[PDB]
């Protein structure tokens, strides 16, 4: 009697934490733009209270408003898009010091890109601008509002 973690409505609140996360420079799912990424991240639905590790989720079974998430392959590796609605907010975990995204002065929404190997291995990406929180590894906690289906 609970909505599982592999079920997202447009309007849910996602609470991702990133145990110690490294900076990427040229991430291809988000164009050619930088990112912080973690190996052992944890995705949380706030309104339902359902918590799950990112690497323990079959990401082909996750649906947004019933329909399946958008997938892209870049250099032979498959990335999954959970589109947000608004900019993704993130900050160093436990510290009030915050970070800001790549399109930090642009009226665009962000997404939440997930690499998935096929087994028990998955990465989680947050679109960033630079190393405003460090070059990594650094604990990051994110916050986003779940968005519409990509047309």
């Amino acid at each position, epitope marked *: 009697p609970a909505r599982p973690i592999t079920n997202w409505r447009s309007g849910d609140v996602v609470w991702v934490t990133l145990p110690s996360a490294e*900076y990427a*420079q*040229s991430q291809s799912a988000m164009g050619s733009h930088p990112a912080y990424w973690s190996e052992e991240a944890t995705i949380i639905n706030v309104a339902t209270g359902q918590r799950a590790a990112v690497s323990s989720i079959k990401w082909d079974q996750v649906t947004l408003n019933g329909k399946a998430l958008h997938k892209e392959t870049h250099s032979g590796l498959v990335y999954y898009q959970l589109p947000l609605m608004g900019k993704i907010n993130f900050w160093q975990q436990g510290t009030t010091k915050a970070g800001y995204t790549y399109n930090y002065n642009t009226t665009d929404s962000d997404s939440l890109w997930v690499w998935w190997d096929g087994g028990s291995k998955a990465y989680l990406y947050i679109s960033t601008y*630079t*190393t*405003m929180l*460090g*070059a990594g590894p650094v604990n990051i906690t994110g916050l986003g509002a779940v968005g519409p289906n990509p047309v």
Partner: antibody
Amino acid sequence: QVQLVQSGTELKKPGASVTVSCQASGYTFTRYGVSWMRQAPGQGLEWMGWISVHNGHTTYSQSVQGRVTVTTDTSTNTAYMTLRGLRTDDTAVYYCARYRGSTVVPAAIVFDFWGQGTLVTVSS
Amino acid sequence: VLTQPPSVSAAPGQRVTISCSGSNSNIGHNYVCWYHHLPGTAPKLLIYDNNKRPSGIPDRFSGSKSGTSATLAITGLQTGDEADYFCETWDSSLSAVVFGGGTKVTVL
């Protein structure tokens, strides 16, 4: 474990060209970058330049007058460094590091997982 | 250009403070790193992001940053810590990686 193993010591003449290798292991070589630093006898380290193995994008310093050239072999996971026009004061221990970070205005480069160094002597 | 004291010294068991001094384009807007280097060996990372240790670095080593200055603290100095210690940051004015000068540590 991540290791960087360089080439052996070399002895050149004033005006020759020295090529220093840097073998990599223990990590995905196309994920990170490789820099090159030197150490003159009696001084601290001086940065020379790097490369990014994702696409190939070198960025050298100004104190060297366009004499350095950094290339990579993707198949053998090995990065190179060719210094031409060897002046007498180019005698140094040339180090290899794993470049990682950003150079935009809040910047942070780490240079973790160095290599053991290579002495190059430019004399007669 | 990063400036360091050439030598810092303490008794076994005390603490040392190794400090750099850059400018607003070296350290005031960027994150500094501290390295450990025996002569004739490879340098080893100690502090990144001004205050953070990698795995396998003891709690004795701690760093900080205050404005355009940055200080490496080695609390509880023992034998085996006799090498050079030097900074690294990005200079947005020169568009280059600038290093310190290295600091000798002599155990009394």
